[model samples]
Target: PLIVPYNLPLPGGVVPRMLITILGTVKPNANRIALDFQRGNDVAFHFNPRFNENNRRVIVCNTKLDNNWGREERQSVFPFESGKPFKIQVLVEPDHFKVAVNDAHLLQYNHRVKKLNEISKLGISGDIDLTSASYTMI
Candidate 1:
């Protein structure tokens, strides 16, 4: 078991070709995990994986601006498992964000907030044991 929520500043903000990586293990009783990219009070990307929502597995991706959530993109295939270690990588591009989980391509999210340079925050929450988090600008 680990802390429920973790927040950190993204060094140099989010720029095109940058990469953000998170390494963690899913708790045995985990229900969900959310990773967010933020600027001020707005979230540029929200990556949520729900294990028990509606008693179905799903991944929900969305963005938030001005405190309102945008339309969510949901996927039924989940690559996470309880007590399993996983790695998540978020690649920042000019028009969209590409994500991979456990070395497999997961999804792409088109830019909704446009200003990538304004994204300065990284947040992780829910039931997980986070081991490492890093950001690199390519």
Candidate 2:
């Protein structure tokens, strides 16, 4: 058995002024894409985009603590499209995390778990081609 987690190969921590950016293209037959911003073993934030829900659009956001997932928040305001390029950015704020795609601000998730530094571990997975991702603390 082994233990390892790659935050898009970042292997680093995050700060309030840090910015997380990702660029990619959705797969032609994409069904979903997921992102996990973790604090230790607990997931501080879960960002999920579904392409198979009602009208094939839904953004599911939630957090999990000690293996118990919290209430989920879903938004029908979808942005990405199959086989189309997309750009995503996340700003680590003092009180919440603001997310945007294609240079347009979409949603902000208030911090359920504070201490942004501990929430450094980031993970992403799903049906998409990740061109590149960058996590920089300033």
Candidate 3:
């Protein structure tokens, strides 16, 4: 897995790119799910921009990212302030990455690439400040 620190920071309703990887046991041979996140208050997840166009089904927190984001949902339980840095607990399972902020809340996102089982790298970019980032899978 990889960790990334942001310099910009983001709010409740925004998309960010992540660069990292995860373990094989949990994520092995899975597909068609979305990622998640749980942080202090600022939480979010994303799908391959193209997925939205294909009209696919994504399950987040047992729900669907395509339907949720389309209805304008708020994943972050708390509110994230700019300049304040937080850690993201990212989990790669099948087709989604479950991310938690400070291990509190969760934001779900889907994969952009086709090979659902061929992911171990992550790249993050969004509207939040990243001071330090790191990831590991065991």
Best by lDDT: 1
lDDT (tens digit, per residue) of candidate 3 on 16-78: 243333211112222222233323222333322111223432322322233444333333243
Clashes of 2: 0
**What shift in Å separates residue 121 of candidate 3 from its native position after superposition?**
4.4
Provide the lowest-lDDT 10-residue window in model 3.
Answer: 22-31
Q: Which candidate leads in TM-score? A: 1
TM-score, predicted candidate 2 vs. hidden true structure: 0.88
Query: Which regions of candidate 3 are displaced past 4 Å?
Result: 1-79, 110-114
> Which 10-residue window of candidate 2 scores lowest in summed lDDT?
1-10
Q: Give the Cα error of residue 35 in candidate 2, in Å.
A: 0.9
Per-model TM values vs. the true structure: 0.94, 0.88, 0.38
How far is each candidate from the true structure, as Cα RMSD in Å? 1.5, 3.9, 14.6
